[PDB]
Structures are given as structure tokens and as C-alpha cells.
Amino acid sequence: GEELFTGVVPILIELDGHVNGHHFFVRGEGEGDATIGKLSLKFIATTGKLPVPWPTLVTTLVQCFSRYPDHMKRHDFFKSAMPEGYVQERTIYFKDDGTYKTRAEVKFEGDTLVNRIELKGIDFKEDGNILGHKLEYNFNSHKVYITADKQNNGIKANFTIRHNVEDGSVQLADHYQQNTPIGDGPLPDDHYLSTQTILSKDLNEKRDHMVLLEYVTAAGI
Ligand SMILES: [Cu+2]
């Protein structure tokens, strides 16, 4: 299934979310180029103004597009599960605030890589950093640490996302992550993904939205 990631692949992403009393929905469309580890997407909040900040959704909103160097192709679980795909479950702990629980299917549908996600958020403080919107519009660079568990024939991962706050603070988000294949036949040595993300806006776009450009490369061997 690494075959399927030579050349540009279009992308569709859908987020169904409930945080406390608010429901929201997000559609993303764009393309991904696994050959250089690049992502280009635009996101729309089809339900009005987001009750959370856009940066808090970035990680739950396709690591099959991580560029794996030639000498690491043995370790690319994400692609090797395609086209049938994989399940990606996360729990995300915002320090001294609420929590996200996310489930999502990442899989091919025609020539389009699809990420369909549902998200549950509980115990977020009103006038905390997430609700009441005190996060700055940007995104830091991280290392995503990946291990195999042969148990669920898949991939576990954890890492800490650092969210700049508008007063110089840093809101931390602890990510706990599992990945499980849907079909059959895919398991790496310990390694990581260095990430980079720029956020921006379409100035002629009136719906609450997010333009995102992202670079990712594997390393550790
Ligand atoms: Cu719903």
C-alpha cells in the first residue's frame, strides 16, 4: 500500500465533535504528497463559530503522508495498512483543563484518502484556555514517538503538543494514541516524526475556517 502514496493524493477529512454542551462539524479538502511529507488542506466550520480553538483540533484532524526515507520504508505502518486502512484512537489531556477522546477511520475511498473522526470532550473549564479562546493562532514543532505493540498488531504513540497562549503561557496537551489495522498484513522499530505546521486564513472566506500547511519526516534510524 506504500504503492498508493507515490504521487499526489487528494484528501477528505470530517470531524464530528461534542465538547460539553456544544456540537460542531468540520470538513477539510486538499491534497497530500507522501513523497516529500507535505500536506495542503483548508478546513471549514460548517456549524458556525467553533466552540474550541482551531489549533486544538489540528492533531485529530493522516500520518500515512509522513515522508519515510528509503532506509526506513520497513517501518511505515501507516501506509502499509492501505487501502483497507486503520483505526486511530486518541485520548488528549489538556493540562489543568478538559480532555478529548477521539475515534477515527483513516482509509481509501476511491482515489481519495479519507479521515472520518468523532470527538468527545469532557470537563473543560469555562474561562480556561480552550473555551474562552486564549490560544494563539499557530502551531509548534514536535516529535511524535512511535512504538509497536504486536498485541493489537499495530502502533502506539504518545507526545505532548505545546500550544502558545496569548499571554506568553504554554498550554500543554498530552496525547495518548493507538492504531489498529482493518484488513490484514502490516511493525516498526522505535522511531519518531518531526512535525511542522503553519496556520493561515483565506481573507475572502467568511465562514470560521483554517488553512493549514504541514511538513512531516520520519527519523530515528
Ligand atoms: Cu454528532
User: What are the start-end ranges of the E strands in 34-111?
Assistant: 38-45, 86-94, 99-109
Task: Report yes or no: 42 and 61 within 8 Å, Cβ to Cβ.
Answer: no
Ligand 1 centroid to residue 69 C-alpha, Å: 39
Burial class (CB in 10 A: 0-12, 13-18, 19+), 70: exposed
Give dist(CA 155, CA 94) in Å, integer.
Answer: 23
Ligand 1 centroid to residue 95 C-alpha, Å: 26
Task: Report yes or no: 17 and 50 within 8 Å, Cβ to Cβ.
Answer: no
Three cell numbers at 34? 507522501
Resolution value in angstroms: 2.6
In terms of phi and psi (left: phi > 0; alpha: psi -120 to 50; beta: otherwise), the region of 59 is alpha
Q: Where are the domains of the chain?
A: 1-221
In terms of phi and psi (left: phi > 0; alpha: psi -120 to 50; beta: otherwise), the region of 100 is beta
Measured from the Cβ of residue 162, the count of other Cβ atoms closer than 10 Å reads 12
Alpha-carbon Rg for the chain, nearest whole angstrom, is 17
Ligand 1 centroid to residue 157 C-alpha, Å: 27
Note the CATH number of domain 1-221. 2.40.155.10
Task: Report yes or no: 193 and 143 within 8 Å, Cβ to Cβ.
Answer: yes
DSSP state of 139: -
- Any bridge partners for residue 122, and if so which? 99
Ligand 1 centroid to residue 18 C-alpha, Å: 7
Give dist(CA 52, CA 130) in Å, integer.
Answer: 6
| Phi/psi at 176 (5° precision) | -120, 130
Ligand 1 centroid to residue 209 C-alpha, Å: 19
Three cell numbers at 172? 500543554
Ligand 1 centroid to residue 119 C-alpha, Å: 9
Ligand 1 centroid to residue 50 C-alpha, Å: 15
Ligand 1 centroid to residue 44 C-alpha, Å: 16
